[PDB]
Amino acid sequence: TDEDAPRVNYNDLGADGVTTPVSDQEEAPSHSGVVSLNADSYKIADTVVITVEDLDLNVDSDLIDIFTVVSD
Amino acid sequence: NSKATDDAVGSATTQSLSFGELGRLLDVTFDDVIWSTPDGANNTATGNDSDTCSTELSNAGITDTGLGATGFTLVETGAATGVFVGDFQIPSFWCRVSDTTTTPYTYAGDEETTTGLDIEVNYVDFRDASGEIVEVGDSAGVRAN
Amino acid sequence: KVYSWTDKVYITIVAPDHNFDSDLVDEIGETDSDPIKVSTRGFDLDNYKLVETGTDTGIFTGEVILTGFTAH
Amino acid sequence: DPTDEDSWTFATNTKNTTSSFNVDTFYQVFDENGASGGSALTLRTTLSSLMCEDNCVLTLDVDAQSSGTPVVTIQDNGDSILTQLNASSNTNANNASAFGISTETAKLGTGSIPVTITEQGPNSGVFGTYDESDKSVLKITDNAKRGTSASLDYNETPQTILVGFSFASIDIQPVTDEWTSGQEIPVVIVDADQNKNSRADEDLDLNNPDVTLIPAL
Secondary structure, eight states: OGGGSOEEEEOOBOTTSOBOOEEEEOOOOOOOOEEEESOSOOOTTOOOOEEEEOGGGOOOSSSOOOOOOOOO | OOSSSTTSEEOSSOOBOSSSBTTEEEEEEETTEEOOOSOSSSOOOOTTSSOOHHHHHHTTTOOOOSGGGTTOOOEESSSSOOOEEOOOOOOSEEOOEEESSSSSOEEOSSOEEOTTOEEEEEEEESSOTTSOOEEEEEEEEOOOO | OOOOTTOEEEEEEEOGGGOOOTTSOOEEBBSSSSBOEEEETTEEEESOOEEESSSSSOEEEEEEEOOOOSOO | OOSSOOEEEEEOBSSOOOTTOOOEEEEOSSOTTSOOOSOOOOOTTTTTTTTOSSOSOEEEESOSSOOSSOSEEEOOOTTOOOEESOOOTTSOTTOGGGEEOSSOHHHHSSSSOEEEEEESSTTOOOEESOOTTOOOSEEEOTTOOTTOEEEEEETTEEEEEEOOOOOOEEEEOOSSSSOOTTOOOOEEEEOGGGOOOTTSOOOOOTTOTTOOOOOBO
């Protein structure tokens, strides 16, 4: 953000004949994640559903993003 | 560099007449002095140090040494509009003309900042409303922060 | 009215007659024809420069830094 | 020809001052497929008797203001056979007077800028300098100066070819309030100086030396 925001630069030849670059920047913030559990009490053999709202975990806009459990 | 109409909008072909110089149509000045590049035979003055004004400008990365070097032209907006437009960009440094009465001009030995100097443009109408020669102009100020 | 050593001085010359060009910030003091000189007992600055506040104001200003003596 | 595609070739250099030289017009020096299609035969002294009223003559001025840098040059394309007759290293492709036609050098040799037009349809009456790949015969020089121009004349009405530069604008356009991870947002550049062909869509490819500028992050 601020001075470190990603910026694209384009060197340019102006109508006054002098070379003057043009540029734009956009900030790339990070997001605070929350995790929640759908119910406050469960019983044996109840479905428990876990949701994580972290925008930073989306790494591709075309594909569904999946995270899996480790068995090693 | 061999004609009185140097670094001005007009023609290399020229004559000396009563009203002034016949080949001059428009020029640009800083502090009421022609904005011209230090070239020719009379640009050997070094000023305070041993560096001539021409190389003195080059070390500052300036390529807009005068009006002729910016590529300034007057272009008619339409085929028959009768309105002419040109543009250029103000430089950080310029080289003053010491004596305008010699051809080529004699240039100073040290570059000067353009900040705090007025800028003017002068147009010479060969035919005014009565068909007589007159010169007209506009002025503005270069500032710094 | 009274200063101290190593103190900063501001000078204001109100000389409307030196407003030569209405669209240029005018300078006084840099020439043999029109010199200025700021001096203390022992030391001086000659052909000092003062500049116009605005282009057609006709007020000239400058500043000098006093320095005192090295043996103290 | 009412059934075929008509080809014409012009000597247009109006500043060739050699006493023997004249601006001239030739018929079917090439085909519509850029083949030979026959010899070049003078028509300049007969155009008065063929009902030409100021409308059969093409002239070109490469440097109108005589600034020393020529604005327009000429190049081969798919509907003509143009050759660089002065191939010396001392000259380059910006010298319009270094091109000619090899088979016809008396009147279309070095200097005397040859220009070829081809009929857009068998019986249309509309001619052009472009070919099917959109490569014109007439091209602006690489070192051309802003504000300077050339003059191309048909039917005793000249037209200027003005050289100018365009201010660019770049702007990243975020789809919603924040640019988050894994979201494509558009980047748009507007610069007329990169549109070097009005009949083709152009990409800013790194690999092409003739694309002068590329955006970078």
